[model samples]
Target: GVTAVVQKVVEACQDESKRLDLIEIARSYPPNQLRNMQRTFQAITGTFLDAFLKKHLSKDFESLVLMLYKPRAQLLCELIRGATKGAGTDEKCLVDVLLTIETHEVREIRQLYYQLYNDSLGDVVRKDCGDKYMWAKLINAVATGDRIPRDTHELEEDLVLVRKAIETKGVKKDEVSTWIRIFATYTRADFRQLHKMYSAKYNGDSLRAGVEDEFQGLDEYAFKLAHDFLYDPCCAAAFSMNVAFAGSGSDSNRLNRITAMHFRECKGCKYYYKKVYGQAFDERCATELKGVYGDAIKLLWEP
Candidate 1:
């Protein structure tokens, strides 16, 4: 059935004599998979539809691609959402295409996103897209950063606040990196605990609202960066686990030193975590928010 459908469309379009039958071919494919078909067609046709954008696409389409060089993937993704009129399935496909793009290819696309959208690719996809489809978007974003994906617990409202805190204001790189690296490790988290540390580090108010507001345009792509930096510890843990147990593999010194420091500094924050929350940071980061980006987080911290 798949081959047959593919054949019928290919034939109808290839046989210019039967050009009128092209609409029939389009109708035969499922809507959700339509973008997939478009991708295939682009492969067959020798270029992206955007290549012919001048002749066929509207002003908006042209404008969206134009922003790529500006390093605004975030805005570009949004524009695509708007230009395509928010077709959920189509949007998902676009994201897929972007995610699967090779490094050099994505470099260009990211440039387009930046030039056209006025935001980072990672930020746009994370914030704007609905949570129901959040995972795929996150996977794609992370892939671009050259980072592998690992499962972890969902970030709660409180831990979300902690993320807001360090990213916005932690004073030291060690403090910031420690919190992010730790959170990146676990499959579950306790937000209330996350919130207490976040709250104590800052004033007394919650940090989520302001950070959410600032990174409001974070699309699924950008969110994964934020997500991983704030939560996924598997990469760091795996590195540590391997060195401590396995004999020094290829480059033992680099791994040994890096992982050792990660555990040490992060442990300090972990102790802080126990004091504040009465339990360890359950696969979460230490609340070294005050230490990492002190005043910066305060900018968005609640009064």
Candidate 2:
């Protein structure tokens, strides 16, 4: 899966002016073939572009990273509002970036993250975060450009510590930090393990419980609305909250505010919203804020 897909993506990347050629090639493929190729293209392109920029390109890192960073950044930037008001899902990717910065480039990027985000990555790193030791390692990796090994004893150690932290009431912060790193590194986490550990620690689904808990401080409908979102777990948790709450009553102020939140959160519930409701999410926030914030939602939420 890794090598073969990577090779195909590299081959596609070899040509840049072939937008039409790429288009034609895309048309040539059957449905599944096209889907797989598209997915592979995106994956290879993101990783390759980042590596190429880090290693060979002399162009601005901001520009190159933006090529990759913007969509994801837009997603993260929007989700921050949910943090303030409780509308978004868990910050899995956002945390990934936070940990990435904690490991790789510490000083300026933190500032850059805030500058671009209108919020602080460090602030989230401090709160909503559990793993300090793993954070230290990821920050080091980001700074030193040390990619975590695909197979490593340290990872296993970290995972064990994380699992232990969730299972044991007395587990240390460092141990919790290890657990987060497991999520940070893997991207996709095993829901069963998270549930088992979290239930042991908190007696319910920790992640879902956290979301529902966040709703407690809000008004009744708002809380019910947010809780309703939980059933469609695939939706970007933050995005759904923003949409449902944005402009719910007759007053446009709440709607406007929530719309702004959607614009900010990049409509987090792309897959879940699509699957449950059968709607396109690629244009998140674009239609809602056109003339106000015209950025293409899909392009913005690419990562």
Q: Find the candidate with the highest TM-score and give its number.
A: 2
Candidate 1 residues lying further than 4 Å off, grouped into runs, are 1-32, 36-53, 63-170, 182-204, 207-303
- On lDDT, the candidate that comes out on top is 2
Using Cα atoms with residue i matched to residue i, what is each candidate's TM-score against the true structure? 0.26, 0.30
Q: Lowest lDDT 10-mer window, candidate 2?
A: 57-66
The C-alpha local distance difference test score for the whole of candidate 1 amounts to 0.37
Q: What is the C-alpha lDDT profile of model 1 across 1-303, one tens digit per residue?
A: 444544555564345354333333333344445446546656676655345333432332223222321223343344444523333434433433343233454466556666765765555554445433333334344424543233323334435544544465422433433333323222223323444556675677543443333332323233332332233333233323232223422232222222222332233433433454455433222232232222222121111
lDDT of 1 at 157: 41
lDDT of each residue in 1-303, candidate 2, tens digit only = 534644543553454432123223323344356445545656656653345434432222223222332233343444443443343434333322333222233454555557765656555544453333343333233322322434445544544555445455443555534533443333222333443455565545454444343222222222223223222222434344344334522222322223322332333445555664555554434444432112222333333
lDDT of 1 at 190: 39
